[PDB]
Amino acid sequence: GTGSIGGGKGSGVGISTGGWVGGSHFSDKYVVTKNTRQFITTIQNGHLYKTEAIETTNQSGKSQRCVTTPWTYFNFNQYSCHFSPQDWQRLTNEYKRFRPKAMQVKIYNLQIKQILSNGADTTYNNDLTAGVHIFCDGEHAYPNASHPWDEDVMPDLPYKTWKLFQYGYIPIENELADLDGNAAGGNATEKALLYQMPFFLLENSDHQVLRTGESTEFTFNFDCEWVNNERAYIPPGLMFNPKVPTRRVQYIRQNGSTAASTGRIQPYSKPTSWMTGPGLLSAQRVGPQSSDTAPFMVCTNPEGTHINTGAAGFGSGFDPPSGCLAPTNLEYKLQWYQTPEGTGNNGNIIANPSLSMLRDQLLYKGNQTTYNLVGDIWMFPNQVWDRFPITRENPIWCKKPRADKHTIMDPFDGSIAMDHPPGTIFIKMAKIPVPTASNADSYLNIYCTGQVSCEIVWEVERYATKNWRPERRHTALGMSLGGESNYTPTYHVDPTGAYIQPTSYDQCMPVKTNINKVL
Amino acid sequence: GTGSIGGGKGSGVGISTGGWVGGSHFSDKYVVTKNTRQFITTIQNGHLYKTE
Amino acid sequence: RPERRHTALGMSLGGESNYTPTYHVDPTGAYIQPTSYDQCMPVKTNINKVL
């Protein structure tokens, strides 16, 4: 049902630079997702680079220093971006693993409008000679624009308008520069940090400038590890045959009155060579919602401790701490809101056990009498665990920090650590100077709308099982009713046009809950 | 991180006549500096040559 | 021996509240200027030549 486009192959105002793409194609080895959004970008910071310091004192809740830029950026990092709930269901039901392979982004059909405000009404007219600056940072030569679990992501519904967020970054750890700080300290390393605090201008590189008849296109080739969709039906410790005897001997030392005994290990409990995976349960969250509450605080202090007992502005919180361990409290569970309007207990989704036996692991230390839970299990030889089951609402990737030494990279939120994730596309409108009598900068008030199309080829692979029995699958019967009068199902739309969100973790259709693997 | 420019190679309103350049490249024998500014120019002297 | 070089450690703080270094920008977006001649990084101060 594709029409033949008429009109010449030329270019300019009155010729569109691309069409709308949408929908997925499933195959055995590949899944192709196509998504187009209409985006809107506006002037940021009045075309200025600014810095901001909180100066802590708990007013904001810690000490941050940020530089905000005139730029905005595209954030594609999330699965709901690329998959409809239908397509995500099909992916997690029909395939044991998948990874992104190739990516193609087009920015096209650009429209710059001048904003004319007279009194109480505002008008919008084309300025056809206005440009927009666009470039991708693929070298990661600038601070990353996006961080996992941000609300800046592409809209889930294809017909919603995507408003870009302002780009900004933290030039320095602000608590490490207290300025005067303490008087008898004679601050030096604090000034030394400020003198070498970097400053980044996107204007320091080459940009493409697009007028309304131009378009631009970016391609990216993923070299990626697979995200696996498989469930362990047993722990690795149960891989034995309980009827078979073992050669192994268990010596039990003298316990109180009970004499030291030796004997053959029972057939139904055979020793395992495989250990609980890493995780930290010992810490608890601190302080009011306003501060940084994470149970572990990862700080870098070059000088003399004194983290002000509340972590001050030193460091960032490490959450979730528990890793693959069974969370012993709600604090340790990954939790988010479906909507930027979510608050409190409304609109929040708590991650639930996937019922995979490589997750929710625990370690118990025997004394002579009993077993006690080991709070902090560190990285140890012979640990095996599965990754956090990712839903359609999880971030896809995180960027690996550039560093000399790193341990196993398995972010506990479930995002894939990548050496070179897709580059961020930065976009701002050309500053249009307005002639002014004084030296105060005045500019023309303009905004740009356009279409972005993302197209990802997913390398995918199906499952084969010798299991006799029907496996668990994701089904619409696990959905719930919502909206006004509560007659609208989960991924449907409200009578007001509101898109009903999943209220539970299973409605988000996590991976590793369905297809069984033999250990 | 340079995109492929779409739209025809023709000219007119709605086609930009260049991109933004910026940044330096250092070498042993050469340094290349690239700078772009946005300039504004206005009418001067009401289009007159005057003496003072 | 190590020769003299230009370093950011010769920069100074400026702007409002005077927490912004030399070539950085103010919270108001003002670009802090070098307040001294050495912050301008003159030539012929660093690399030695034998006469």
| Subunit contact A206:B22, Cβ cutoff 8 A | yes
CB pairs < 8 Å spanning A and C? 45
For chains B and C, having 3+ Cβ pairs within 8 Å is answered: no
CB neighbours of C37 closer than 8 A, spacing ≥ 6? none
CA distances A85 to A26, A376, A476, A490, Å, are 14, 37, 10, 10
Place of tokens 């007279």: A118
Residues A426, A202 contacting (CB under 8 angstroms): yes
What token pair was written down for A20? 């709308």
Residue A236 DSSP label: G
- ω into A320 cis (within 30 of 0): yes
Residues A294, A331 contacting (CB under 8 angstroms): no
* Distance from chain centroid for Cα A470: 33
What token pair was written down for A122? 């505002």
CB neighbours of A307 closer than 8 A, spacing ≥ 6? A297, A299, A301, A314, A315
Distance CA A419, CA A401 (A): 8
CB neighbours of C4 closer than 8 A, spacing ≥ 6? C45, C46
CA distances C14 to A182, A197, A270, C20, Å, are 20, 13, 69, 5
Contacts of A204 in chain B (CB under 8 A): 22-23
Which among C18, C24, C28 is the nearest to A197, CB-wise?
C24
| Subunit contact B14:A128, Cβ cutoff 8 A | yes
A301: nearest Cα among A288, A290, A312: A312
Q: Virtual CA dihedral for A93, A98, A103, A105, nearest 10 degrees?
A: 30
* Distance from chain centroid for Cα A403: 21
A167: nearest Cα among A195, A196, A203: A203
A470: nearest Cα among A518, A509, A507, A515: A515
Q: What is the DSSP string of C1-51?
A: -PPP---GGG---BSGGG-B-TTSB-TTSPBPPP-STTTT--SSSSS----
A394: nearest Cα among A314, A508, A502: A508
Rg of the Cα atoms in chain C: 14
| Subunit contact A206:B19, Cβ cutoff 8 A | yes
Distance CA A476, CA C44 (A): 75
Residues A196-221, buried b or exposed e (16+ Cβ, 10 A)? ebebbebbebebbbbbbbbbbbbebe
Q: Which chains touch A (3 or more CB pairs under 8 A)?
A: B, C
| Subunit contact A196:C28, Cβ cutoff 8 A | no
What token pair was written down for A123? 């008008």
A286: nearest Cα among A301, A306, A308, A303: A308
What kind and span of H or E run contains A193? helix A189-195
Q: End-to-end alpha-carbon separation of chain B, Å? A: 53
Q: Burial level of A66, CB count in 10 A (0-12/13-18/19+)?
A: middle
Can you list the pairs that A142-146 forms with residues at least 24 positions away whose Cβ atoms lie under 8 Å? A142/A169, A142/A200, A142/A202, A143/A169, A143/A170, A143/A200, A144/A169, A144/A399, A144/A424, A145/A73, A145/A75, A145/A169, A145/A424, A145/A426, A146/A73, A146/A75, A146/A77, A146/A424
Residues A455-494, buried b or exposed e (16+ Cβ, 10 A)? bbbbbbeebeeeeeeeeeebeeeebeebbeeeebebbeee
**Listed resolution, Å:** 2.5
CA distances A442 to A48, A114, A338, A390, A433, Å, are 12, 14, 39, 48, 6
What kind and span of H or E run contains A349? strand A348-350
Backbone angles phi, psi at B44, to 5 degrees: -120, 140
Distance CA B22, CA A75 (A): 24
Residues A62, A292 contacting (CB under 8 angstroms): yes
Distance CA A79, CA A87 (A): 11
Place of tokens 């005077």: C18
Contacts of C28 in chain A (CB under 8 A): 50
SS3 A485: helix
| Subunit contact A196:C9, Cβ cutoff 8 A | yes
| Subunit contact C8:A199, Cβ cutoff 8 A | no
CA distances A1 to A4, A18, A89, A109, Å, are 10, 17, 26, 22
Residues A71, A166 contacting (CB under 8 angstroms): yes
Place of tokens 């209409």: A38
Q: Please work out, in degrees rounded to the nearest 5, the angle formed at the alpha carbon of residue B38 by the alpha carbons of B34 and B40.
A: 140
Name the residue in chain A with its Cα closest to that of B5: A216
